[model samples]
Target chain A: HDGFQTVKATIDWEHPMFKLYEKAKRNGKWNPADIDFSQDQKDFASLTSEEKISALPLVAGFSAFEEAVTLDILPMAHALARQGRLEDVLFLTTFMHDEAKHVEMFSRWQQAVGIGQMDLSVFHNDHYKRIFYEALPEAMNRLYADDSPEAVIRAATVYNMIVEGTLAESGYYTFRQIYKKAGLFPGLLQGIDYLNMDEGRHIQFGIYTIQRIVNEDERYYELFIRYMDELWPHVIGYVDYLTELDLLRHYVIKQFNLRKKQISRT
Target chain B: HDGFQTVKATIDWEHPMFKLYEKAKRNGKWNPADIDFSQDQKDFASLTSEEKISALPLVAGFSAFEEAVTLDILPMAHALARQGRLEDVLFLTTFMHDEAKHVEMFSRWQQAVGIGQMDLSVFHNDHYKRIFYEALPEAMNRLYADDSPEAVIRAATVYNMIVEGTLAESGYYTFRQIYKKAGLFPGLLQGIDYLNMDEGRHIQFGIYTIQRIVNEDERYYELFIRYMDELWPHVIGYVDYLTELDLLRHYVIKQFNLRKKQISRT
Candidate 1:
């Protein structure tokens, strides 16, 4: 199969839960905060059941978000290949691997803490399903159907950069804060630190990838600016959804203020 | 303190060898390839003087490269912070930490193999010292003197994307291949693998960082593209040095071909 087809096949579109689990597993072990922790406390005990359960949905949501972002523009990876843009191809390959790893990282978290069964049902609901599996694929199909690097980068910037960096950072910070407040799940915060570390890398990668491509072609630059203008609204809409979801509403509100503060200084 | 001063103070830039050794000790116990080795075979009772001396420079060079790449961009990180680009600021903090860990990983490898005398003297020679200590600062000063976002991104693209990605990959692929081929160093390959994995993430992050900046401003994009065009020759010029020096040349050539082949197919 081609790169696109190979990636698509490996993606597990029907029961992406497995892939999500794999993502979590890969990421679960890395404790970014552990670097700062003294050697004595590095091997402390794991989380409680209550703490684990509360965190499952967010982990699942993040897993789904990762898939959504990757699925949203996978076709562009192949499109870049067809256009003979080798650097872009390399960029997309790295991006695909990153998203796939994220899926594994989040999925591993669900499994390690034993939250998969409970979260599985919650994720099956149409609203939940639509945001990740359904809506993501639809969005990606539409964007990739255009088969333009500009469109792909724009989609990625909005979904991955603006949404993941800005919106997701807010969510992560909220979760970290909760973990801090309870001081219950030390491992959870460590995992968040790892995720935050990876997310920072991903966000920066998105920024640079867009910059290189746009620099290569001015017409694409204009298109990207337009794409960002159009796509920013959708991200804003998603933030609104996070606000409405009762389970996430509190975190969203908190994240909003934090995100606003970040934006203000930016 | 300014970035140069802060980095000089916080980082033992003149002798960052200990950081790598400390990191290696922490992370380099079990090699992926060593798992199947018999316990009896794992312990090498003795080694020749020639064997020890030859390995030292390679170990030091690898460690130095890791540290230099991390520190090379300190000025850029501070510039972004001063400009109050919060997202960029956050993005670079992650970069800094990742590089630090990577340096540590190399250090750990040195300790695992029982290599002693981790010194920066090898890197302080005219060519190595000139590039990182003198040439880099001169270039960065010229590039960022204007303090424009475009200028910063352009300077960063050259260092982070083009130089770091292409050159680092060459060096790493060589290091791994040489270690594996020699059979003198057993667990070094795994350490290299860990470092490669992290470097891949860093390279992706560089791409994303430049892409975002470009998308934000096309003039910046154009400026970066122009700068990259001018810089490509110099970037490729390093290959000649590597080739003649026989330090990382063979591996560099092999990796470049591999990369080119990978890009062609992609």
Candidate 2:
């Protein structure tokens, strides 16, 4: 019987959160189906075993990350919906849609390039499993039963601040450095361009949500820091396997610190 | 550690489910903010109190419906994603996005008309709650633990077939009959036009999923019918409160029969 916020109060069309939703509607409509992967397909076929050995794992790693988060994000969005956080839920629709498109793009890129039927779970090493399989889902799924500020902060921190903001952002930079520098994988590069724009809005939503929760009570910032510290270590382990370990590590750390500074401390 | 389907097998871009995802990307990318509601604001103010009474409940009813489904759908989508039905999950991403936009549109429509701060939960009579509050969420949430054909069919039947296919479709018809005839509420009508296109793909997805399950085993069709029968009565109770009760009732019956025929028997 609780009335809707739309009916209870006028929608704040000017709020940062609602503006992000507007940006999502404007910039987030590209289809994975529309991207032409032919150049990447040709480029992929020419790679040596050594080159593939270096590259396939990254592909599988991102595939795993995209797929896991695609499965994981719904609970948080559902939590917001249940609480009648309509604007948050509205922005999240684009977030979830973008994740699914990311998964499909990676999947299609692998197929377009003729990578067939490999058990890439080997790429989901201990570090990846701990963050994605264990911690990410644990944080997100907790929202189903716990709608507390602490739960929302932990979920967004791991999701937006760490996974998408830090790891995936670095992953895109790594992709551009390797592929863009070599002038290869136009299709993959093209997909990542769209994906990056989508993530821009997503990470913004995460920061806004975290700040909203923290601003309500400064004590919640401590919870965000606690969860971030516990999970931050596992991030480095995955970077160790990538092409530029230090570069990615630094990016992750800088991104995390940037996220911390972005949140209102008081 | 299970490998991804995109890596395990070539994505069947030609598959019905994947095609549905493609249609979604093309057709379901509308923003709730795009529709101009200025005229609707004027039309709403000019209405008599009797007209307001008749119309407000429908607006509140749909807001409730859209809001509930936005909350309810994630578990079903999560189930598909967990089972690694990548194509199904891809299609469902748009499905969930469409539901969120539907919720946003209704919420925005209510706000544009200056319907402020009313606890319209009185409109959520026992029949509405039984379906949306109880049966809908229960069937969808059961997918979290039970990924069986029965579970999927029950969720799809209650969701796509009953809630969307039967109820929402009829609700749209009711809106058109009342408003379209009077030549009023263009913004509401505009929003519904986009919503109808979105729901077309959604209901097709439900029918496709249900048929895929039933076709796997003839026994599953019985399960579908059984669930449909159990849930169908509660659907009529909603129609009993709508304008032109018999017209809405007929539409619900026709839609249900059409859905039954659309699914495969063998």
Candidate 3:
């Protein structure tokens, strides 16, 4: 993990996932404000009460998740520093920035739609409490306290695999699919398009991390399985509360299964 | 610390320490390779074994201290983010990078001069153990768990005043004086000169922060003094283990008393 080849012309950092650094730079964000939520506000006003009520839970839940991740990635960066992966740490630096920016993006949209005083606590259901309010911070904080690779893998599973990859991915597809059909929220969709691309790259990196960890130690594969098994119920129960729950559930399974296969091969 | 001027004609971010961001940019570092520790290696080799032995404790101790501070500042930045000072957070992003760069600079110097494999833990006497090994992390970790302003003030007291301003300032003067007389190690001196300028700005910001915190409520001044008093003995004891104990002690008293007066005024 360390060296200084002052006299040498060849030194390899041997990055874990080399391309993500450039990809992160290349697909970097525009000003989230440029999404111009004026149309999103109108789109919000025109929604049926039923539709608006349905929207609050997912958006609010996600804002909380983003905020949680923003805080949690501090510890993750701390962990990677322990491993002496300067490139990995450099990417996670942007990862923390992205999470922080996502929170701002969602908060701006919610406020523009006149929910500026939106009480996130009001929207978080029991499962959001279980996963976000409790588990996410606990996992990341555990990694902060102990830099075991197991800690890293667990935190990523709860965050990237379940929260971002399965849940958020499903929610984005549902919103994009539903909003496209309804001809509403071009601004919201644009923002989500960018956010999804960012998250997709993030999820891709998470998959590589998890696969590599499992490859390094087979027992981490067991831990990943047990963790997924333990948390899947809460993830299911939470999604079951939302609109397009079936659509979300179907996609979650598809994504989860795909990742499971990927992990299995490693 | 909170705001919603998203629709304003102008922003008065009114930075608590506005110049710090730019100062960081202007003073930011070159590659460790750029310093060229080749002369440092030759100079170190030429030293009398007694003189060389005298040098190891301070150089190695600072590298260890730099590593401790590098890791600790994550929680400090996390603390600032909770207060919603985007400028402060922006400044801290540079602050952490500087600490990390210092760690690399000194560590590279150590390696280049043949102490690269040096285990710093062997030098940790009781006083050094109390400050760098125990108290410093304990204080910063408290702020991580609870972002109370009191915790912030205490942590800054330990870090900015005691470690950087008082101990490090005195240590730097000692090293600069000794090495200048030896008429060698220009590369290490070059790095130190860069580091001192960067740290002077940091110490200035720290003074402002402590003054502001204590002035906001008189109670924090008492805590600052008490915390400094608690840590001051160890700073003295730690320096006693080195060659220039009297000069270091005299200067520590000078720096400590100066900051105490500044804290009182605020």
Candidate 4:
């Protein structure tokens, strides 16, 4: 009863997860408010009507996705805290904060450029609705009741593997390329760079955590794959609506395969 | 279903909670690892056995309390995230991060100063055990089944008010005064400064959150008081064991009364 992992044993600072936590404390330090969006307002104004209309979906999609993640990511951290995984729990505090900052960046960008008043839910199509509204919460909330490794794996699969690893990772690349090609929205681009860097650490933790979970029970490897399969349709469907680019589909597949390989190696 | 609060309307940046969130990002930035504890090592070596033994309880109590809060505090944030209070949700991300850092700070101090290997749970008397191990989790985990205002108020009263406001606040003051008088543990003193600043904002949020909760239903006011009264015995008992100071008991009473006054007005 007395042996809280931290109180009972030396913290394995050499662990990869703690290393990621240190990186987050030092390298991942950026504030959403610090980004200068004056040029974003300028770049936004000069766009043609077609370019402006095209950007509406992008802005609104990110707004919904980031906000959804901000609201949805807490329960998993709570589960880790309850399980006494103090090191992992410590890292997730930063994870939730970064998600909040991402949401703030998008919200500020929308408002600073005059689109904040609009209802972006119009961009939340059926696919986004199913993933964010239904699946994300359902899988995450399960942790409140079930703290089993399988349950944690299911959550890591949905949040880390699919949402972050697949959907968000692809969204970042596409968003950056579109803006970079046009050489517009440096502030937004810089914010995305920070998001990408933050998410990189998050994804690294996700892979590490999932690998730890699967290693505890090799059978859970099957659980991870089956859950990924179950979520595949909606994630793909949302990307289809998000951008008709086949590149995103391949990228998501590649990312998932990479995750599977990484988890299996452990 | 589509009207997610953030997507459907402009975020009220003027909201006190959001303002606090901004303040957290801007002013509340400090890393636990950044504090230099080299002097602390030298100071610990010079202490008499009596001085060293006296300091053990303080160190152990903080390690337990900080780690306890790091674990226990998540459920409240999860509750807020579930409620779609995006601004509060964002602030809590820092809240949780700060708690984790406090835990990290204490753990690092213990290791750096050569006290890292000892099991401090011997210091967790029955009173300390009851508050953290039993009452705290019971009140917090209730939010999973009941998202009522009463549930949240109970949680805020226990966590924000009593834990951070009364117990930790007093501990910080006493700890600092002792070390300052002795001219020892400069590093520990510096770390306490960061903890005090971080917890100052946390206690502010606690008061504000409870007010918001009580404002939604004045009836919950009685629930808040009843919970505080219910937990008061264990809190005082733990303080008796930690420091048999009459000043602490009065301080606790004063803090509780101040909270009641603040919440009653709303």
> Could you say which candidate leads in TM-score?
4
Q: Write the per-residue lDDT of candidate 4 for residues B1-266, one digit (tens) a residue.
A: 24566577656788787888888888667887888888899889888878778888877778777877877777777777667677888888888888888888888888888877777777778888787777777888888778788878888898888877777777778888878998988888888898898887898888888888778777777888888788878878887887751665667777766766666734
For model 4, the superposed segments whose C-alpha errors exceed 4 Å read A1-3, A243-250, B1-3, B243-253
lDDT per residue, candidate 4, A120-160, as tens digits? 67777788878888888788888878988988888888988
Q: CAPRI verdict on model 2? A: acceptable
Give one digit per residue, the lDDT tens place, for model 1 in B19-131.
33224223433323222223212432255666555555445545656555544554564465355332343334335445544554555444444443334344233444444
Instruction: Give per-residue CA lDDT, model 1, range A1-266, as digits (tens).
Output: 11111111111223322233233324433422133333213222254556444555455556556545533444444455445443343334334444433443444444444443442434223444434445445544555257566566655555555567655776678767766786645555665676676566556555555666666766766665565455444544554544444434455445434422322111
Q: TM-score of chain B, per candidate?
A: 0.62, 0.95, 0.91, 0.93
Over B39-121, each residue of candidate 3 has an lDDT whose tens digit, in order, gives 88988888889978678777767776676676667778777766655456556655665665566578668777886655545
lDDT of 1 at B145: 46
Give the clashing residue pairs of candidate 3, or none: B111-B116
TM-score of 4: 0.94
User: Could you arrange the candidates by TM-score from highest to lowest?
Assistant: 4, 2, 3, 1
- Looking at model 3, what is the TM-score of chain A? 0.90
How many angstroms is residue B42 displaced in model 2 relative to the true structure, after the best TM-score fit?
2.9
- CAPRI-style quality class for the chain A–B interface of candidate 3: incorrect
Expressed as tens digits, the lDDT of each residue in A1-266 for candidate 3 is 12212111111224554356446645653445567888889889988889887777667666666666666667777777667555565466456656645665776687778765646456556786788767877887787678777888898898888878777788788878978988887877887888887887788778877888888879899888888778888888887766434687788888776666667735
For model 2, the stretches where C-alpha displacement exceeds 4 angstroms are A1-15, A243-246, B1-3, B7-10, B117-119, B243-246
Report the number of the highest-DockQ candidate: 4
Model 2 clashing residue pairs (backbone)? none
What is the C-alpha local distance difference test score of each model? Answer: 0.48, 0.81, 0.71, 0.80
The sequence of per-residue lDDT tens digits that candidate 2 reaches over residues B209-231 is 89888888999999988888888
Comparing 1 with 4 on lDDT, the higher-scoring candidate is 4
